[PDB]
Design a protein around this ligand. Structure first.
Ligand SMILES: [Cu+2]
Length: 228
């Protein structure tokens, strides 16, 4: 599996939380990325959709730094690697920190879906998905912060849901990665957010989904509605 090793945010590179290195330090470095204990490169499945682990991954603790990002600009998430079998959507959220993102209680965050891509070509199951486009693009996912989004501090929660086992109850594998950003801009728009532990249920149609059977009915991307 992969994790996000860094991001390019409004033109500038920020190193992420190197989960294969930083957990083995008594004094890990400051980063905009949240720490996790997911040293096995693992995931949170449906057994943890109501655990705080779903918010920013296993045992996640606040990143200490925050990246300044102009509204309307692009963020690129650099994943270390991604397996071809792990087809699924890429979903990205913003939750206001109401203060410094370095100290917000992650369980109080209310996430707004700002980007989501799912099934691209279902003609030949298991199909071609957003993560396959990410793989082709140097293992990099891309999102646009809405130009109209209200300035302030936000947790940016970027996630792949791998669906290779998702026909099973609790089979979908969620890979959330969180980063602190401060948006600047001239807009005032903000979505109505959803608590991390309310984003997904193991019975949801976009969670318990068989990618190996006929895909002509499409894929309903899970989670709350996309910000408009
Ligand atoms: Cu796997």
């Amino acid at each position: 599996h992969g994790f996000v090793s860094g991001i390019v945010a409004d033109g500038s590179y920020y190193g992420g939380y190197n989960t294969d290195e930083y957990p083995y330090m008594s004094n890990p470095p400051n980063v905009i990325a949240w720490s996790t204990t997911a040293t096995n490169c693992g995931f949170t499945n449906g057994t943890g959709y109501q655990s705080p682990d779903i918010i920013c991954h296993s045992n996640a603790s606040n990143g200490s730094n925050t990246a300044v990002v102009a509204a309307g600009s692009s963020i690129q998430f650099q994943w270390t690697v991604w397996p071809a079998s792990h087809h699924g959507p890429l979903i990205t959220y913003l939750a206001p920190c109401g203060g410094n993102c370095a100290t917000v209680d992650k369980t109080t965050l209310d996430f707004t879906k700002i980007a989501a891509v799912g099934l691209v070509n279902g003609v030949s199951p298991p199909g071609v998905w957003a993560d396959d486009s990410m793989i082709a693009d140097n293992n990099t996912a891309v999102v646009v912060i809405p130009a109209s989004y209200a300035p302030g501090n936000y947790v940016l929660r970027h996630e792949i849901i791998a669906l290779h086992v998702a026909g099973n109850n609790n089979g979908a594998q969620n890979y959330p990665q969180c980063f602190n950003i401060q948006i600047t801009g001239g807009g005032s728009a903000q979505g109505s957010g959803v608590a991390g532990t309310s984003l997904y249920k193991n019975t949801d149609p976009g969670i318990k989904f068989n990618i190996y059977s006929d895909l002509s009915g499409g894929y309903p991307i899970p989670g709350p509605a996309l910000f408009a």
